[PDB]
Amino acid sequence: NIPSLTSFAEENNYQYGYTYAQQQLNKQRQDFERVRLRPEQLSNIIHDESDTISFRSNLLKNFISSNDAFNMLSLTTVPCDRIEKSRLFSEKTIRYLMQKQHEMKT
Amino acid sequence: HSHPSDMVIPDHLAELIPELYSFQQLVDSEKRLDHFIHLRNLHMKRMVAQW
């Protein structure tokens, strides 16, 4: 097949109305461009991450994540002088930067 | 669930924490290192097959 560019012309094709070579080329045209342009009627209809995203699950997760983070704010009756600060380094990041600074003189 | 989306620290954190650029161009510095290993492997598949 792989019919033509002349078979795609408007003269050899039907229009809103109101030969043999044309009716032979339009067989191969409609037999080529209906196995090429047909959509996939099976799975892999996900196509990406941002099509199977769920508004209901994210809305439920945000309803939980706002409620518990607001219960963290108001109901935690620890005064501001008593809120102890967290460490800016870990127990492993403080070992690796003692190791690499020891090995930095090479 | 390999999400390609969440490998990016796009703007809002990197403007606040400037070390994230030092993180991100770290990762890119890894990504051209492993590729240098990859062109190495296709090198070592070649020369043995050459010999």
Partner: peptide, 24 residues
Amino acid sequence: YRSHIFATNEERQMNFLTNELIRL
């Protein structure tokens, strides 16, 4: 500068050490 978080002189030198080791 972020001296509100990095208030101690220790943690500022630790952050500078981190940037130094990254660049090296």
